[PDB]
């Protein structure tokens, strides 16, 4: 997937898709006020 290798078992349900769908090449994006005292 660009940096590492993903190891996957090819199931019968996987019968139409591309291999590249099963190793995602990007990581999920996982992303206090002034009060006056005087």
């Amino acid at each position: 997937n660009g940096k590492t290798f993903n190891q996957v078992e090819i199931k019968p349900e996987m019968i139409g898709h591309y291999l590249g769908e099963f190793s995602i090449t990007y990581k999920p994006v996982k992303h206090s006020r002034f009060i006056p005292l005087k």
């Binding site: 997937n1 940096k3 590492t4 290798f5 993903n6 190891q7 996957v8 078992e9 190793s23 995602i24 990581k27």
Partner: peptide
């Protein structure tokens, strides 16, 4: 009389899933 007290007297992931895609 002073004493010789130099020192102080008190003593859910599949098998092949990489760390990326996990």
């Amino acid at each position: 009389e002073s004493l010789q007290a130099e020192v102080i007297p008190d003593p859910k992931v599949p098998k092949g899933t990489s760390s990326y895609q996990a």
